[PDB]
Enzyme design. Structure first.
Site, PDB file in Angstrom:
ATOM      1  N   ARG A 110     -10.417   7.383  16.719  1.00  0.00           N
ATOM      2  CA  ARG A 110     -11.712   6.723  16.595  1.00  0.00           C
ATOM      3  C   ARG A 110     -12.036   5.855  17.805  1.00  0.00           C
ATOM      4  NH1 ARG A 110     -10.307   4.952  10.461  1.00  0.00           N
ATOM      5  NH2 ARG A 110      -8.401   4.413  11.625  1.00  0.00           N
ATOM      6  N   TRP A 165     -15.115  -7.285  13.295  1.00  0.00           N
ATOM      7  CA  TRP A 165     -14.065  -7.763  12.393  1.00  0.00           C
ATOM      8  C   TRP A 165     -13.513  -9.091  12.881  1.00  0.00           C
ATOM      9  CZ3 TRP A 165     -10.076  -4.323   9.457  1.00  0.00           C
ATOM     10  CH2 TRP A 165     -10.770  -3.513   8.551  1.00  0.00           C
ATOM     11  N   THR A 210       0.007  -1.033   4.561  1.00  0.00           N
ATOM     12  CA  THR A 210      -0.791  -0.097   5.358  1.00  0.00           C
ATOM     13  C   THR A 210      -2.274  -0.477   5.437  1.00  0.00           C
ATOM     14  OG1 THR A 210      -1.258   1.418   3.515  1.00  0.00           O
ATOM     15  CG2 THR A 210       0.763   1.842   4.793  1.00  0.00           C
ATOM     16  N   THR A 211      -2.685  -1.537   4.730  1.00  0.00           N
ATOM     17  CA  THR A 211      -4.020  -2.127   4.948  1.00  0.00           C
ATOM     18  C   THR A 211      -4.107  -2.745   6.334  1.00  0.00           C
ATOM     19  OG1 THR A 211      -3.459  -4.354   4.113  1.00  0.00           O
ATOM     20  CG2 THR A 211      -4.316  -2.772   2.493  1.00  0.00           C
ATOM     21  N   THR A 212      -2.929  -3.052   6.872  1.00  0.00           N
ATOM     22  CA  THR A 212      -2.691  -3.837   8.086  1.00  0.00           C
ATOM     23  C   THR A 212      -2.988  -5.326   7.919  1.00  0.00           C
ATOM     24  OG1 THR A 212      -4.881  -3.708   9.198  1.00  0.00           O
ATOM     25  CG2 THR A 212      -3.394  -1.813   9.429  1.00  0.00           C
ATOM     26  N   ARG A 243      -6.832  -3.395  -0.244  1.00  0.00           N
ATOM     27  CA  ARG A 243      -6.228  -2.144  -0.731  1.00  0.00           C
ATOM     28  C   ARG A 243      -7.044  -1.480  -1.839  1.00  0.00           C
ATOM     29  NH1 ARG A 243      -3.813   0.811   1.871  1.00  0.00           N
ATOM     30  NH2 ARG A 243      -5.717   1.952   1.301  1.00  0.00           N
ATOM     31  N   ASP A 286     -10.739  -0.441  -0.801  1.00  0.00           N
ATOM     32  CA  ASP A 286     -10.655   0.736   0.052  1.00  0.00           C
ATOM     33  C   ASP A 286     -10.320   1.984  -0.765  1.00  0.00           C
ATOM     34  OD1 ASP A 286     -10.045   1.926   3.028  1.00  0.00           O
ATOM     35  OD2 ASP A 286      -8.593   2.621   1.553  1.00  0.00           O
ATOM     36  N   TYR A 331     -17.070  -2.565   2.917  1.00  0.00           N
ATOM     37  CA  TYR A 331     -17.204  -1.538   1.889  1.00  0.00           C
ATOM     38  C   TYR A 331     -18.262  -1.867   0.841  1.00  0.00           C
ATOM     39  CZ  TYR A 331     -12.525  -0.251   3.632  1.00  0.00           C
ATOM     40  OH  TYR A 331     -11.443   0.058   4.419  1.00  0.00           O
ATOM     41  N   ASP A 362     -17.600   2.521   2.478  1.00  0.00           N
ATOM     42  CA  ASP A 362     -16.608   2.791   3.553  1.00  0.00           C
ATOM     43  C   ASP A 362     -17.255   2.715   4.937  1.00  0.00           C
ATOM     44  OD1 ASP A 362     -14.472   3.575   5.203  1.00  0.00           O
ATOM     45  OD2 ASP A 362     -14.648   5.690   4.654  1.00  0.00           O
ATOM     46  N   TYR A 388     -16.052   1.060   8.304  1.00  0.00           N
ATOM     47  CA  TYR A 388     -15.449   1.077   9.640  1.00  0.00           C
ATOM     48  C   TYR A 388     -15.443   2.494  10.202  1.00  0.00           C
ATOM     49  CZ  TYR A 388     -11.761   1.003  13.218  1.00  0.00           C
ATOM     50  OH  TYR A 388     -11.034   1.166  14.377  1.00  0.00           O
TER      51      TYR A 388
HETATM   52  O1  LIG Z   1      -4.937   2.340   4.636  1.00  0.00           O
HETATM   53  S1  LIG Z   1      -6.001   3.366   4.679  1.00  0.00           S
HETATM   54  O2  LIG Z   1      -6.648   3.491   3.356  1.00  0.00           O
HETATM   55  O3  LIG Z   1      -5.403   4.668   5.049  1.00  0.00           O
HETATM   56  C1  LIG Z   1      -7.146   2.925   5.795  1.00  0.00           C
HETATM   57  C2  LIG Z   1      -7.140   1.412   5.960  1.00  0.00           C
HETATM   58  O4  LIG Z   1      -8.353   0.858   5.443  1.00  0.00           O
HETATM   59  C3  LIG Z   1      -7.063   1.147   7.452  1.00  0.00           C
HETATM   60  N1  LIG Z   1      -7.276  -0.265   7.799  1.00  0.00           N
HETATM   61  C4  LIG Z   1      -7.836  -0.250   9.161  1.00  0.00           C
HETATM   62  C5  LIG Z   1      -6.930   0.530  10.102  1.00  0.00           C
HETATM   63  C6  LIG Z   1      -7.652   0.706  11.426  1.00  0.00           C
HETATM   64  C7  LIG Z   1      -7.976  -0.652  12.040  1.00  0.00           C
HETATM   65  C8  LIG Z   1      -8.756  -1.527  11.065  1.00  0.00           C
HETATM   66  C9  LIG Z   1      -8.033  -1.649   9.728  1.00  0.00           C
HETATM   67 CA   LIG Z   2      -8.662   4.950   3.313  1.00  0.00          CA
END
Ligand SMILES: O=S(=O)(O)C[C@H](O)CNC1CCCCC1
Ligand SMILES: [Ca+2]
Ligand SMILES: [Ca+2]
EC number: 4.2.3.61
Length: 536
Positions: A252, A261, A389-391, A429, A432, A508, A513, A515
């Site tokens: 991306r 953000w 994995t949300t970061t 989480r 999303d 969101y 959704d 980003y």
């Molecule tokens: O965890 S997932 O559902 O696969 C997708 C997550 O919303 C990803 N979070 C973003 C990752 C990219 C940089 C900004 C945060």
């Molecule tokens: Ca996702």
């Protein structure tokens, strides 16, 4: 080796942000007037003999206008005085505003202030349905609840249904303010976004507006906007020189959205360095995400994950060429951070963000294994992996790097996954997962949140999404409780976490959704915050 077909939209911004030349004359003019306006405003706040309602409205207006960051000590002292004098003898409008402002600032004012407005059953007196200003402030207040505030259980539904009923016949800009509020409450909005709307769509059109405040707010917004544009330029050049848009074409191209953000996490000038560091991290981890999500093979991803754990330029040779690119870029970025914090003597704190990044990558790899195996874990096991994995543990940690007052103790507290952090992560989480369920389901993601939830509990998609919504509501209450005094760290280090949660709600909105698809939600915000100045 067959790779997936690229499917992301191109960046929609082109080069329009790449170069910004501030007009020093205009900037210095603004700054000179703001100083005068700032002092006039300070004296408004410090004025003696103000009624309670007048004081609360003044503070509320200054906050919505986005200029309260100038008056943190003043506003604190005043709200503290109000908290301790404990006067419960007001109408619904003043009571609900008093409640919201104190709670938002960590003062644990009792929800009993609302009892006089309810019957013996805890339901709000229906005779208050014709008081629009009361309903509006109650509505806004209903969003700052904690678990100890079940007395307010009816507040959201009550105010909502009667605000909806009244709205079509209200005068402007009250009508627009109510309509906006129903779509986006103040407490869960991104501060710059709500501020922009308030200044331009509401306060500017109020018959009763204070001209000193309005001028102050417009100048300040436009002045800060110059800095943000400078930052975005500096960041756009950094990204360009990396040139991932051509060498890693699968990934991306979203550095502008990443900047939005970071701007959401903090907008104030003192956090300029912090913002620039943060947006680079978000950009870079977005590259890593897409590598796991839409390009890398299982064996490639395994090596990538191991190299990250070892964190050592020696390991690049274990990697495919295309992975060497992002991997070196990652190592370098953190070497930049270290040097950038050297003179402040804060280089040592960078390792906290690195350990969180390692965590994110480990769980990305687990997520890939699950998909490949067709594994659908129980909800508890799903979350044990999918929260990282949300970061958001990683981003919150990163948000601290450029904050001059962030100490080792502050990082130590964060590293233990405190509840306010966990709640923010949970909100990201589940929202999303609710927003992205259908498309991921079409891509054969057997281990999506909702899917895991459905299988685990044996419930329908609908029931699963409702359960996920409850988790989000519970988490917001935890966030709100997490702001109450005394706090475990400075408020300054909680607000980023709160703002990360706001980022979710805004990105969101309406379960969209945003980003991945910035055309939908983020584009108007970016234009309003970073392209168009407020007309004076
Ligand atoms: O965890 S997932 O559902 O696969 C997708 C997550 O919303 C990803 N979070 C973003 C990752 C990219 C940089 C900004 C945060
Ligand atoms: Ca996702
Ligand atoms: Ca992903």
């Amino acid at each position: 080796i067959v790779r997936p077909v690229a499917d992301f939209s191109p960046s929609l911004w082109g080069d329009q942000f790449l170069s910004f030349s501030i007009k020093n004359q205009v900037a210095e003019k603004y700054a000179k007037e703001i100083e005068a306006l700032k002092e006039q405003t300070r004296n408004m706040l410090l004025a003696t003999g103000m009624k309670l309602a007048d004081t609360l409205n003044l503070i509320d207006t200054i906050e919505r206008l986005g200029i309260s960051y100038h008056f943190e000590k003043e506003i604190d002292d005043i709200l503290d005085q109000i908290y301790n004098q404990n006067s419960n003898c007001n109408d619904l409008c003043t009571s609900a505003l008093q409640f919201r402002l104190l709670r938002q600032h960590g003062f644990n004012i009792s929800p009993e202030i609302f009892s006089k407005f309810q019957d013996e059953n805890g339901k709000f007196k229906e005779s208050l349905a014709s008081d629009v200003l009361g309903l509006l402030n109650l509505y806004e207040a209903s969003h700052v609840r904690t678990h100890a505030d079940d007395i307010l259980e009816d507040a959201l539904a009550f105010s909502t249904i009667h605000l909806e009923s009244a709205a079509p016949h209200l005068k402007s800009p009250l009508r627009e303010q109510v309509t906006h509020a129903l779509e986006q409450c103040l407490h869960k909005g991104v501060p710059r976004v709500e501020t922009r709307f308030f200044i331009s769509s509401i306060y500017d059109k109020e018959q009763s507006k204070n001209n000193v405040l309005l001028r102050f707010a417009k100048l300040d917004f436009n002045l800060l906007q110059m800095l943000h544009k400078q930052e975005l330029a500096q960041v756009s050049r950094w990204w360009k020189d990396l040139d991932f848009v051509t060498t890693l074409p699968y990934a991306r191209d979203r550095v502008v959205e990443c900047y939005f953000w970071a701007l959401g996490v903090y907008f104030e000038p003192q956090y300029s360095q912090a913002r620039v560091m943060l947006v680079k991290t978000i950009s870079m981890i977005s590259i890593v995400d897409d590598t796991f999500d839409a390009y890398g093979t299982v064996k490639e991803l395994e090596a990538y994950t191991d190299a990250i754990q070892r964190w050592d330029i020696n390991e690049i040779d274990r990697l495919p060429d295309y992975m060497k690119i992002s991997y070196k870029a990652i190592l370098d970025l953190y070497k930049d951070y270290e040097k950038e914090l050297s003179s402040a003597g804060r280089s040592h704190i960078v390792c906290h963000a690195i350990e969180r990044m390692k965590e994110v990558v480990r769980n990305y790899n687990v997520e890939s294994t699950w998909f490949i195996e067709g594994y659908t874990p129980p909800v508890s096991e799903y979350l044990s992996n999918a929260l990282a994995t949300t970061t958001y543990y990683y981003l919150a940690t990163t948000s601290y790097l450029g904050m001059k007052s962030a100490t080792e103790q502050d990082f130590e507290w964060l590293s233990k996954n405190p509840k306010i952090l966990e709640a923010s992560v949970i909100i990201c989480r589940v929202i999303d997962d609710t927003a992205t369920y259908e498309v991921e389901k079409s891509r054969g993601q057997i281990a999506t949140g909702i899917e895991c939830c459905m299988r685990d509990y044996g419930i329908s998609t609908k029931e699963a999404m409702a359960k996920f919504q409850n988790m989000a509501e519970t988490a917001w209450k935890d966030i709100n409780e997490g702001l109450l005094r005394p706090t475990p760290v400075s408020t300054e280090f909680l607000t980023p976490i709160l703002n990360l949660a706001r980022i979710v709600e805004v990105t969101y909105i309406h379960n969209l959704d945003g980003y991945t698809h910035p055309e939908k939600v983020l584009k108007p915000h970016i234009i309003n915050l970073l392209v168009d100045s407020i007309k004076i």
